[PDB]
Amino acid sequence: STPIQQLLEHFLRQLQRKDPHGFFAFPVTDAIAPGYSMIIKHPMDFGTMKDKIVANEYKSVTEFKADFKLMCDNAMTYNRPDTVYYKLAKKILHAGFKMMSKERLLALKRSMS
Ligand SMILES: Cc1cc(=O)n(C)c2cc(N3CCCCC3=O)ccc12
């Protein structure tokens, strides 16, 4: 397991600790979410992000963050604002973007010299 993959698995673990109920752990199916696959044409979830890390498909933290943003944005698109899904997506988006902020990654870069 390479250096980049370790870093990504670390970010991924900290994000998933924000979702104790595993709402975002796996893909949303039309059977639990009517109309989901028509409303959300670019689905994403933490399981898929795990798989992509395992398959070494991420070239950068930017790419991992884009997937995480996608996941959150989907939940805020599909679900009404009074729902647990919308609220948790909104909270975790902002928290995960602080965690993986440009300035924090610069700090990390510094330390990796
Ligand atoms: C209805 C619905 C909307 C939504 O945005 N999300 C993220 C959902 C997620 C679930 N899932 C999918 C598998 C992980 C466990 C879970 O609660 C189940 C239902 C939903």
Residue numbers in the entry: 22 to 134
Mind quoting what the paper says about this structure?
The C7 position was viewed as an ideal attachment point for a structurally complex heterocyclic appendage that could exploit this cavity for selective inhibition of BRD9. Furthermore, analysis of the BRD9/1 model suggested that a C4 methyl group on the quinolone would occupy a shallow hydrophobic pocket, thereby increasing potency. Changes in the melting temperatures (ΔTm) confirmed that nearly all of the elaborated quinolones were tolerated, and valerolactam 6 was selected as a lead structure for further characterization and optimization. Co-crystallization with BRD9 showed the conserved H bonding of acetyl–lysine recognition: Compound 6 exhibited H bonds to N100 and to a conserved water molecule. The valerolactam moiety extends into the desired hydrophobic region between F44 and I53 whilst positioning the amide carbonyl near, but not in H bond contact with, Y106. Furthermore, the introduced methyl group at the C4 position demonstrated additional hydrophobic interactions with A54 and Y106. ITC confirmed the activity determined by the DSF assay: 6 bound to BRD9 with a dissociation constant (KD) of 612 nm.
Bromodomains (BRDs) are protein interaction modules that selectively recognize ε-N-lysine acetylation motifs, a key event in reading the posttranslational modifications that constitute the epigenetic code. The closely related BRDs BRD7 and BRD9 are part of the SWI/SNF nucleosome-remodeling complex, which plays a crucial role regulating gene expression programs, including the expression of inflammatory genes. Although BRDs share similar acetyl–lysine recognition motifs, there are significant differences in distal parts of the binding pocket. Owing to a shift in the ZA loop in BRD9, this region is much larger in BRD9, with residues A46, F47, P48, T50, and I53 forming a large hydrophobic cavity.
